[PDB]
Amino acid sequence: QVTLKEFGPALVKPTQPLTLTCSFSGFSLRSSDTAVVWIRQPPGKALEWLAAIYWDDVEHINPSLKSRLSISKDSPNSLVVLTMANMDPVDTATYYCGRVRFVSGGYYTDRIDSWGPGLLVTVSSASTKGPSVFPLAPESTAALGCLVKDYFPEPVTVSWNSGSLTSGVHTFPAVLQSSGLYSLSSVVTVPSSSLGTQTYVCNVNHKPSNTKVDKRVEI
C-alpha cells in the first residue's frame, strides 16, 4: 500500500518561484526500481511530465522547462522537492506527485503506478481573500445549504456536522465572477421531518486564507 502527498502554496505571484515538496510512504526511494515524478495538469488540458528523480540520482527533466526546473531528494526522509522558477499565469495547474516504477534494463519501461491527490497552484497577482459563509434555507424532503461567497484562490472544501453527514450532500463546482473572485454552494437533502429535531452545520474550509467557518443553517 503506497501513498503520496503534495505540499506547496495555493497561490504564487508572477515571476516568483514555485517550490513543491512530495512526502511519500509505503516504498523507499533507495529501491533500485523506483523513482519519484512530478506531473502537472492545467485546467481542462493534457497531463505534462515535469521532472523525475531516480534511486541513483538520475534525473529526467522536461527539456522544454530545463532552465526553470530543478529537482532534489532526501531518501532517508522520503522527501522529493521540485522548484520552478519564474512562474507565469499559464503555469496555473494541478501538480501531482508519483512513484515511477521500471525494470532495470528494459529500455524506458517506466510507468507512473502511484499518484498523490494533486495540489492546485494558482499563479496570480491577485491577493488571497477568504469567503463569507451564508446559510441557505427555505413536502417530502427539504434542501438546506451554505453559500461560500467571494474567495480566492481555489480550492474550498465543505463538510456537514464535521463530516458526520455525508448522505445527500452535494457540493457544487465554484463559479468565477467578473470580480476575479470564486464562489460555490453546498446543499444537503434532508428529510422534512428532521428539520424539527436535527441541527445542521456546514463546515467551510479555505486553507489559502487559513479560513474555517462553521455555520448553523435553520429557517
Binding site: 497531463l47 511530465w49 527539456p63 517506466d110 441557505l136 445549504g145 457544487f172 463559479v175
Partner: protein, 211 residues
Amino acid sequence: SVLTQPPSVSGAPGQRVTISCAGTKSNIGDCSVSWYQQLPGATPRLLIYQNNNRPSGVSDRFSGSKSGTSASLAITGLQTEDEADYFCLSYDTSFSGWRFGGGTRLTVLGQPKASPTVTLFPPSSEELQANKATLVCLISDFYPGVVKVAWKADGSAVNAGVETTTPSKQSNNKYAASSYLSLTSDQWKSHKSYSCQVTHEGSTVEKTVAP
C-alpha cells in the same frame, strides 16, 4: 505533445472502442507505452504499462496494442463507468524526454434522459445586513449535460449580475451546474419576484422566490 490522440471517442453500451496514440519511431516506435485513465475531476490511474500489460485490479476489458509508429487502447464491453479521460505515455529519444498524448475524452451513450431538479435559494438575512443579496440557483442530476439558464425579475428579463457555471459531470455520470444572481439588498427588495429558468431538452422548468 507529438503523441496524437483523438480529442473525443464515443460508444454505445456493450460495444468495443479504440483510442489511438500516434507518434514517431523515436517515441512510440521503440519505447514502451503506458495508458492512464482519469475519471471526471479525479486522480489519474495506471491502466496499461509496457504497451500491453495490466496492473492488478485493472479490468480485463482493457488492453493495449502497439503496431508501428502508433499505439492503441481497446475497451470491450463498454460501460458508463468507463467515461473518463485517457492519456498515453512514452519516452522520446530525439526529444530526450517523456511526453503524453493530448488526451482523449470517452463518452458512453446508453444513459436514460433525466430532467433537472432545480433548487432556488433567496438571500440570507445575514447577507442582507451587509446590503448585499445573492440568489443561488442550483441545478443537478440532468442528462444530457446541456442546459440554459435565464433569470426573470417579475416580467422582464435579467442579464447583469448573472454568473452561470459550465455543466460538470457528477459521480453518477449525470451533470450539475449552478447560477448566481448578485444584487444589492435594495435591488432584491425592490422587485416583487425573481425566477430562475432552466431549459433542458426542449422543456423549460421554472423556480421562483420572493421577500
